[PDB]
């Protein structure tokens, strides 16, 4: 099977079929350089059955700056690189059988041994050898998937070749869409109309299936190719021979296999299918490909890479590139700058770019071994020329190696920028999947390793769980239930002994703002967020905007990822970007009229919360507010009203006393949820009732419920009964054993249970989507008397003791599979689904939807971490606006889009006065300084007269209010009454617009000093 506790988050990304295909697959990886190590790490974290790492190079001091598993002892002993890293790699995932190899590769090497590997990845291999290996691999039956990846300084090359014909079983991996049908016309071709404000969002040529269609019963169960006509309509083909449309209908998107044609590596070198990553330079990938091919030819010709600063070598490389360009089909122009920089940084190696390319290549390997997504076709050329482009023309002496571990990075970015990196003060927020990779990149780049000023602060309150080991490679199984930051710091210190780190456990929130005051942010140079929610992102961005400090943001949703770069005085902040809010499920839809499995899952989750967390909390709070039941009864008899008293009384009268009573209560709850509710709803609205227009009320998207008869033999009913009984026993503190969960024991208990007869009641049911949950309806006197009688009976029965007035409150924990929370939610959701004839969902989908688990995989995390590290380098260098690039990537397509970061927008108020979001105004005063003096000072310093003073919720001054015109004479200390904690106070000021009737135009925040 599949270890769900470890692969829970990856299971949603890939699927159990892809997971089973990931086993039984043997992957051969060669080179074990900086890039090969990243690829191997990502693959082992993914969970491939067996990986064979192979290398022949001996470890060197230069390798320490690129390999995060090597140590100085390995260099001393001159061990093989694969042998040295084999022990560490295997510990990442014990399920993976990792083996090392050292068989030499050359012209005469026999390639017969590669037939046992599904996929082959080659790094740091000579080009003719790659050609021969690819030719052998693609000619096998079945073809062996070939992937080649290389990194030379700041330039990278990625290649894929999955045989002549590769069968993709899933083009995108998105959830199939469901489109509700409004009306279908009998025509050749017929036209299908969707419901209003429900765009189908479909593409011409896709195949759809139909069900629950009245009139055209033939269309049910059939598959038709469609042509898009309008956002709410499309054509499916001839429908004249069918019966006229009545009502109803659901169309479901159908996924089909797709065939992708690749080509041999030898032929691809002349007509490359490069993937465009920057639409502003569509022809850049072709030029980069030409330059790298010229570099390979230079290596073949001279047996060495070009020397940095040797003009003759650069001229020779340019000549070779010019010669190569003519042989290309398109004959593109040779980019002198790209060739020159490739010559300059040929011998270097950039760690973040290596990590990004490793993530992409690992995703491609997974595509090769599973067919889950559309593979790359065929070349991907990532580059980081922006890092050195802003440097202009530096001297060669800044790039010469100096013997330390940072020679690889120095040969790329020069000594000056390396020194600037070592003195950074980085405040890294959150230490999740992205945080660990960012720490690894920091250790590789030497960030904060200086003994003078460098310092890294990482803060995180969570604890390590088993499911986190799949993505966060810095953690180990023995680290479970330990702080994330401490473990990450301990591991990073192992990676680079010189690094300075300072872990924290505080959660970044306004409650902890005292620790992370303004001075602390002033000390920091770069702030990086690895958060998973939105509110924390907005809070951190607001703090950074207040303190004028650059912020880097990133996030991953499965194969999707995005990076955002925020720079003071240059780019818009995160708060300036506002997405539409979350999709609120209508209250009427959730409560009474579900239409999809998501609605039932949400209803089950809310029912669980209300039954086991909210209601017990109310019960405990009520019984702690008052002494005992006698006092409450006396108050009620005197006419006193208490909040939620009747509900508490009802709960007390139904408290189970033993396991049998708990089972009976679960049975009654089942009957109420899935038998009485449907009958009540049908009684309120019969199946054949119609509206004023004559249309059936029970039409799409509403679905008519049907009662469910209890049956212990049904596995679903038994599962629900068991889970409900266990949860109720836990809440009411009733001991039980597994024998009590047996079907026979439950049947014996249920033999004596009498089922109360259902009786319909007159209740108002909200049907409009705009309706929401109303407040508490006042309770009639008869219900009050019933509650009084029940409470008196409980008191007289001596069942109101202290033990009876307390009951434990459960917390919804989803990762713990033995508590039965997810089992109960799944049982309730499926049972409700059968009530409304909705398709049931399995346990894992319910766990994902109810728990709001965000799918995530290691490869996307590594890629976004590498890109964020590149942007951090750019920020540290203080480069101009054009250098920074926001990134959005979706490896499922695959697609990578680099775009310029959003330019800061200037907002004008009056007389040409303009301000940015980064601007903050300062005012100084004294004790007798009045509001009129404040207005005069503002109009003097900035030329604009204030007309609106706000401090949060405080209403300070408006000239138009009838009675507050006198406030101009009031001093600040009396107008706002500020706290004495600080010497200044922040205010929000607006000015009257040039056109009357409009609200005063808000201005930049203004900080007023009391002295
Ligand atoms: O408190 P809620 O989570 O909103 O659930 C309540 C509650 O049902 P449970 O106690 O079974 O969870 C009501 O029962 P009381 O505790 O008030 O007796 C029940 O009312 P009825 O038993 O009278 O049907 C009502 O259902 P409704 O609003 O349809 O009357 C139902 O609400 P939901 O199940 O829709 O949440
Ligand atoms: N306000 C905050 N301050 C500090 N750390 C935060 C804050 N909000 C979230 N975090 C951290 O963000 C991290 C997010 O990590 P990640 O995205 O890998 O998921 P996770 O929390 O480990 O779990 P899962 O992926 O299962 O939801 C968590 O470790 C959490 O501690």
From Swiss-Prot:
The modification N6-acetyllysine is found at residues 507, 692. ATP binds at residues 9, 433, 460, 468, 471-472, 484, 508, 533. One of its GO terms (cellular component) is nucleus. It comes from Homo sapiens. This is Ubiquitin-like modifier-activating enzyme 6. Keywords: Acetylation, ATP-binding, Ligase, Magnesium, Metal-binding, Nucleotide-binding, Phosphoprotein, Ubl conjugation pathway. It comes from the Eukaryota. Activates ubiquitin by first adenylating its C-terminal glycine residue with ATP, and thereafter linking this residue to the side chain of a cysteine residue in E1, yielding a ubiquitin-E1 thioester and free AMP. Specific for ubiquitin, does not activate ubiquitin-like peptides. Also activates UBD/FAT10 conjugation via adenylation of its C-terminal glycine. Differs from UBE1 in its specificity for substrate E2 charging. Does not charge cell cycle E2s, such as CDC34. Essential for embryonic development. Mg(2+) 1 binds at residues 462, 465. The active site is at residue 588. Pfam families: E1_4HB, E1_FCCH, E1_UFD, ThiF, UBA_E1_SCCH. The lineage of its organism: Eukaryota, Metazoa, Chordata, Craniata, Vertebrata. Changing residue 579 to A: Impairs ubiquitin activation. The gene is UBA6. Transmembrane segments: none annotated. Pathway: Protein modification; protein ubiquitination.
């Amino acid at each position: 099977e599949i270890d769900d506790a470890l692969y829970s988050r990856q299971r949603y990304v890939l699927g159990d079929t892809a997971m089973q295909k990931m086993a039984k697959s043997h992957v051969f990886l060669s080179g074990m350089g900086g890039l090969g190590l990243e690829i191997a790490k990502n693959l082992v974290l993914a969970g491939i059955k067996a990986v064979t790492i192979h290398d022949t190079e001996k470890c060197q001091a230069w390798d320490l700056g690129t390999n995060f598993f090597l140590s100085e002892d390995d260099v001393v002993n001159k061990r093989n690189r694969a042998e040295a890293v084999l022990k560490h790699i295997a510990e990442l995932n014990p399920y993976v059988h990792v083996t090392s190899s050292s068989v030499p590769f050359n012209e005469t090497t026999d390639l017969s041994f590669l037939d046992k590997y599904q996929c082959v990845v080659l790094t740091e291999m000579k080009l003719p050898l790659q050609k021969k290996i690819n030719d052998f691999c693609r000619s096998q039956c079945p073809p062996i998937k070939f992937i080649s990846a290389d990194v030379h300084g700041i330039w990278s090359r990625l290649f894929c070749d999955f045989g002549d014909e590769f069968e993709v079983l899933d083009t995108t991996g998105e959830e199939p869409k469901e489109i509700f049908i409004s009306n279908i016309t009998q025509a050749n071709p017929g036209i299908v109309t969707c419901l209003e404000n429900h765009p189908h969002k479909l593409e011409t040529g896709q195949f759809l299936t139909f069900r629950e269609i009245n009139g055209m019963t033939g269309l049910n169960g059939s598959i038709q190719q469609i042509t898009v006509i309008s956002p709410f309509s499309f054509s499916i083909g001839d429908t004249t021979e069918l019966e006229p449309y009545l009502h109803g209908g659901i169309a479901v998107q159908v996924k089909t296999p797709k065939t992708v044609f690749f080509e041999s590596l030898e032929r691809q070198l002349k007509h490359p299918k490069c993937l465009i990553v920057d639409f502003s330079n569509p022809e850049a990938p072709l030029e980069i490909h030409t330059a790298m091919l010229a570099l390979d030819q230079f290596q073949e010709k001279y047996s060495r890479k070009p020397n940095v600063g040797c003009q003759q070598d650069s001229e020779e490389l340019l000549k070779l590139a010019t010669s190569i360009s003519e042989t290309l089909e398109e004959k593109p122009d040779v980019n002198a700058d790209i060739v020159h920089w490739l010559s300059w940084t040929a011998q270097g190696f950039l760690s973040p770019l290596a990590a990004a390319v490793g993530g992409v290549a690992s995703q491609e390997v997974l595509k090769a071994v599973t067919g889950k997504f559309s593979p790359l076709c065929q070349w991907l050329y990532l580059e980081a020329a922006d890092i050195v482009e802003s440097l202009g023309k530096p001297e060669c002496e800044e790039f010469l190696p100096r013997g330390d571990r940072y020679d690889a990075l120095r040969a790329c970015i020069g000594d000056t920028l390396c020194q600037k990196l070592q003195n950074l003060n980085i405040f890294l927020v959150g230490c999740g999947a992205i945080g660990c990779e960012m720490l690894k990149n920091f250790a590789l780049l030497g960030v904060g390793t200086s003994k003078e000023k460098g310092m890294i602060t990482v803060t995180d309150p969570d604890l390590i769980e088993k499911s986190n080991l799949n993505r966060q490679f810095l953690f180990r199984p023995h680290h479970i239930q330990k702080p994330k930051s401490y473990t990450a710091a301990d591991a990073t210190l192992k990676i680079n002994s010189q690094i300075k780190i300072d872990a924290h456990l505080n959660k970044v929130c306004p409650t902890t703002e005292t620790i992370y005051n303004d001075e602390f942010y002033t000390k920091q140079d770069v702030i990086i967020t690895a958060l998973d929610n939105v509110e924390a992102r907005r809070y951190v961005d607001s703090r950074c905007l207040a303190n004028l400090r650059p912020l880097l943001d990133s996030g991953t949703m499965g194969t999707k990822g995005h990076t955002e770069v925020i720079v003071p005085h240059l780019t818009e902040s995160y708060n300036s970007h506002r997405d539409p809010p979350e999709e609120e499920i209508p209250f009427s839809t959730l409560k009474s009229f579900p239409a999809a499995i998501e609605h039932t899952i949400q209803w089950a989750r809310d029912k669980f919360e209300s039954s086991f967390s909210h209601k017990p909390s109310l019960f405990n709070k009520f019984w702690q507010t008052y002494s005992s039941a006698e006092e409450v009864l006396q108050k009620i008899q005197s006419g006193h009203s208490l909040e939620g008293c009747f509900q508490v009384i009802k709960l007390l009268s139904r408290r189970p006393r033993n396991w049998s009573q708990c089972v009976e209560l679960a049975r009654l709850k089942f009957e109420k949820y899935f038998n009485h509710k449907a009958l009540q709803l049908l009684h309120c609205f019969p199946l054949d009732i119609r509206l004023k227009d004559g249309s059936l009320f029970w039409q799409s998207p509403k679905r008519p419920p049907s009662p469910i008869k209890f049956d212990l033999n049904e596995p679903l009913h038994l599962s629900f009964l068991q889970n409900a009984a266990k949860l109720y026993a836990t809440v009411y503190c009733i001991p039980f054993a597994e024998e009590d969960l047996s079907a026979d024991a439950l049947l014996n208990i249920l033999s004596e249970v009498k089922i109360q007869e259902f009786k319909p009641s007159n209740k108002v049911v909200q049907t409009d989507e705009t309706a929401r949950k109303p407040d508490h309806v006042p309770i009639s006197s008869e219900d009050e008397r019933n509650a009084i009688f029940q409470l008196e009976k409980a008191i007289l029965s001596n069942e109101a003791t202290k033990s009876d007035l307390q009951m434990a409150v459960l917390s919804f924990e989803k990762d713990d599979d033995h508590n039965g929370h997810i089992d109960f939610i799944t049982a309730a959701s499926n049972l409700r689904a059968k009530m409304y004839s909705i398709e049931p969902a399995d346990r894992f989908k319910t766990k994902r939807i109810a728990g709001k688990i965000i799918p995530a995989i290691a490869t996307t995390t590594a890629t976004v971490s590498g890109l964020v590290a590149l942007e951090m380098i750019k920020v540290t260098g203080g480069y101009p606006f054009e250098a920074y690039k926001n990134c959005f990537l979706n490896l499922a397509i695959p697609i990578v889009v680099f775009t310029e970061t959003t330019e800061v927008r200037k907002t004008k108020i009056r007389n040409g006065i303009s301000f940015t979001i980064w601007d903050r105004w300062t005012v100084h005063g004294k004790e007798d300084f009045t509001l009129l003096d404040f207005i005069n000072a503002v109009k003097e310093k900035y030329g604009i007269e204030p007309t609106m003073v706000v401090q949060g919720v405080k209403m300070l001054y408006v000239p138009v209010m009838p009675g507050h015109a006198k406030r101009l004479k009031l001093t600040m200390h009396k107008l706002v009454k500020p706290t004495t904690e600080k010497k200044y106070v922040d205010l929000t000021v607006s000015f009257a617009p040039d056109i009357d009737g409009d609200e005063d135009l808000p201005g930049p925040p203004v900080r007023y000093y009391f002295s």
